[PDB]
């Protein structure tokens, strides 16, 4: 019989004042949470945000809400959540965020006979990650997602995750293309504002790049033409045209590889570890067309200096360009 | 009790009439303001703008929601916001403004019981900054905030800061990857328009452009191209050949340099200093391509001129590069 | 004198850098604190014109410079960090991770 349950609900929502949180005056009212991850979109590196997709599901028992006759959960329409009390819950590192309303508003309102109210919605959120990226491409990060109560203290609200650790669920089934995840923690704490202090809860990510084709078309030219234009000591005075040729087709390819590498890597203006390992390469080439120059000109007057001067060159371009690559790997790898 | 709160709070709103402000036809009404600055998203150059988030407070007195017999500050739900009145500040030079609205809006309302109201938005907003990008990527750029009461004159409200130079916090949470936070400052004024004067604050910034960026990528490659144009002068005329794949390498990587944020730009007409090192840069390097052209020309009648050229050019060019550093570093720096 | 703080290990997750100051009557109070990109050097009223406060990121240390002592200076000092979303400033309880005590006369 619908008209009792349309008598039990209107009886419910009679005298109901949205404007006082339940219990007011008394103890603070508990809020449980739980999160569905759906997705994560994209981690923008030049935007330094990700996008994440969640069911977001909250818990209160409020005892204004309290019906007696029917053994029954009452799923409302999303509607009654217009003429209920529901928490103020927002997250402090988003920059835009919107609940779905295709259909209609995913909006959830779950009334129990104990006075229980679940409250589910479904949003898309754009939240702000900070990233280190002075180790590109073989970089680390953790990404958070912050929930706290806008207006109500702790004198008036406290959050808890429901379930403890399994309250975040479906973070294994989230691919990225890039990244992959490879641990996801739950906090729980209180943030002191200047104008009190109000809970918080946080859901961190650690995300880790992968390696691939990538890591080598970046690397393997610069290092294979450097390595390529230490051929120039071991020609003699004879065939210098060869030397000269050498020495200029090393320079304008690894400018042409460096541009059209650069065309790709994201757009952030502030020195990572692959510019510096270009810049490096491109010193080690400069270098060598300076020593070619040198030697060039003293050969005549001096044949056995220059001479002497190829062969210490020999090998002391191989061992420093290796004493490079081993500091460059101790501090960025 | 609630049911006595519910009373107190609904003899407050009867008989209110939100169309009025506080004491009107009276003294004007004092409102004091809080901004606590969550972040900075960006600052763009090529729209000329930066986006902004905050907690924007506003605290002012209102006697007719002045309530008695409760010695507590009621913090109420944010849409009784709706039914009071509320001051009508507004951003002059901001684009595109929002109240985040995930869960709910983000807005709360506390009233005290000497009926004074206290307002907090969390705002994100972008607001217009004009660029003077003349001593780009050496420049400092001073962006404003300007916060102004639409409908009411002087006679009507007044505005302040909120402590006075502590008003504004959060200054140290901001981190912007090409830029750094110099200094901030608060201003307190009125403006004159064809309708009246009205009070206005500015909460303004001196952001300074991180240099390393730069420096790795555009001045250290432009300087060794110039350093190797200097070689062709130390190579003798039988070589020619040589002199000639030297002074054509260098010209073309000198254009080829700095081709890597031409988008993240506007059209500006006038000259960045950044332009001016590059045209620099490419004179001097198109200078010892003439320089070789004429020797070669000449030195076939002429061979001691053509020689006493070179060793002049050979000791000129580094003199004048570095004269023309001094001048360049002394002058933007 | 010049205390100089020097943090080891996940410094970016902590971005600031905080200093207290505790009384042998009293409990601990904010003195100053330094953004390593905010370029906001905060400052106890107390303490201020008095203390400077300098970061450098070469071996990640902060500076504090003290000059014009008094005899209320007498207290024993910590640093500690503080997480990027951690909320103010002022209060201790936001932070994290401390340092061991040091004692000013």
């Known amino acids: 019989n619908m008209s009792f349950v349309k008598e039990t609900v209107d009886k419910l929502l009679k005298g109901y004042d949205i404007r006082l949180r339940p219990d007011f005056g008394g103890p603070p009212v508990c809020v449980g949470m739980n999160i569905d991850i759906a997705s994560i979109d994209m981690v923008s590196e030049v935007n330094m945000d990700y996008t994440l997709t969640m069911y977001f599901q909250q818990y209160w028992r409020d005892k204004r809400l309290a019906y007696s006759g029917i053994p029954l959960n009452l799923t409302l329409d999303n509607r009654v959540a217009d003429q209920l009390w529901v928490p103020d819950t927002y997250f402090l590192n988003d920059k835009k965020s919107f609940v779905h309303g295709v259909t209609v508003k995913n909006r959830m309102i779950r009334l129990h006979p104990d006075g229980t109210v679940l409250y589910g919605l479904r949003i898309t959120t754009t939240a702000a990650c900070m990233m280190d990226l002075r180790r590109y491409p073989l970089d680390e990060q953790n990404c958070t997602l912050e929930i706290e109560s806008y207006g109500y203290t702790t004198d008036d609200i406290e959050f808890y995750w429901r379930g403890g650790d399994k309250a975040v669920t479906g973070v294994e089934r989230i691919e990225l293309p890039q990244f992959s995840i490879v641990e996801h923690r739950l906090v729980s704490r209180n943030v002191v504002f200047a104008t009190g202090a109000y809970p918080r809860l946080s859901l961190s990510f650690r995300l880790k790049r992968n390696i691939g084709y990538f890591i080598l078309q970046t690397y393997m030219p610069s290092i294979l033409i450097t390595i390529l234009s230490w051929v120039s000591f071991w020609i003699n005075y004879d065939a210098s045209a060869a030397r000269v040729a050498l020495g200029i087709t090393t320079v304008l390819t690894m400018t042409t590889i460096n541009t059209h590498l650069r065309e790709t890597l994201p757009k952030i203006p502030y020195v990572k570890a692959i510019d510096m390992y270009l810049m490096g390469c491109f010193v080690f080439v400069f270098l060598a067309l300076l020593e070619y120059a040198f030697v060039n000109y003293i050969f005549f007057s001096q044949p056995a200096r220059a001479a002497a001067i190829d062969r210490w060159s020999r090998i002391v371009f191989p061992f420093t360009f290796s004493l490079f690559n081993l500091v460059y790997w101790l501090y960025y790898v | 009790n609630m049911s006595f709160v519910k009373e107190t709070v609904d003899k407050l709103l009867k008989g209110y009439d939100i169309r009025l402000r506080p004491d009107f036809g009276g003294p004007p009404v004092c409102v004091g303001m809080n901004i606590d600055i969550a972040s900075i998203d960006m600052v763009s150059e090529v729209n000329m703008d930066y986006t902004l988030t905050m907690y924007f407070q506003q605290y002012w007195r209102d006697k007719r929601l002045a309530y008695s017999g409760i010695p507590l500050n009621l913090t109420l739900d944010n849409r009784v916001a709706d039914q009071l009145w509320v001051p009508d500040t507004y951003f002059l030079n901001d684009k595109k403004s929002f109240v985040h609205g995930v869960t709910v809006k983000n807005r709360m309302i506390r009233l005290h019981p000497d009926g004074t109201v206290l307002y907090g938005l969390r705002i994100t907003t972008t607001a217009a900054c004009m660029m003077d990008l003349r001593r780009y990527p050496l420049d400092e750029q001073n962006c404003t905030l300007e916060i102004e009461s639409y409908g009411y004159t002087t006679d009507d409200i007044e505005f302040y800061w909120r402590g006075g130079d502590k008003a504004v916090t959060g200054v140290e949470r901001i981190e912007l990857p090409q830029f750094s936070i110099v200094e901030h400052r608060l201003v307190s004024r009125n403006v004159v328009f064809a309708t009246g004067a009205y009070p206005r604050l500015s909460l303004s910034f001196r952001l300074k452009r991180n240099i390393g960026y730069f420096i790795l990528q555009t001045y250290m490659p432009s300087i060794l191209i110039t350093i190797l144009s200097w070689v062709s002068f130390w190579i003798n005329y039988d070589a020619s050949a040589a002199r000639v794949a030297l002074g054509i390498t260098t010209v073309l990587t000198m254009t080829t340099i700095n081709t890597h944020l031409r988008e993240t730009l506007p059209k500006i007409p006038y000259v960045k200093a950044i332009d001016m090192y590059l045209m620099g840069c490419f004179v001097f390097v198109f200078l010892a391509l003439l320089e070789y052209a004429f020797v070669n020309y000449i030195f076939f009648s002429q061979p001691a001129r053509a020689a006493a050229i070179d060793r002049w050019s050979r000791i000129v060019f580094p003199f004048t590069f570095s004269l023309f550093n001094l001048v360049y570093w002394l002058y933007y720096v | 004198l010049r205390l100089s703080c020097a943090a080891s290990?996940?410094?970016?997750?902590?971005?600031?850098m905080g200093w207290f100051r505790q009384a042998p009557g009293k409990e601990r109070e904010f003195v100053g604190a330094?953004?390593?990109?905010?370029?906001?050097?905060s400052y106890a009223d107390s303490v201020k014109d008095r203390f400077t406060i300098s970061r450098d990121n070469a071996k990640n240390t902060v500076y504090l410079e003290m000059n014009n002592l008094k005899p209320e200076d007498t207290a024993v000092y910590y640093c500690?960090?503080?997480?990027?979303?951690?909320?103010?400033?002022?209060?201790?309880?936001?932070?994290?991770?401390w340092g061991q005590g040091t004692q000013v006369t």
């Open positions: 290990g996940h410094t970016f997750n902590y971005p600031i």
């Open positions: 330094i953004s390593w990109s905010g370029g906001s050097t």
């Open positions: 500690a960090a503080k997480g990027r979303y951690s909320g103010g400033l002022y209060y201790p309880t936001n932070y994290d991770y």
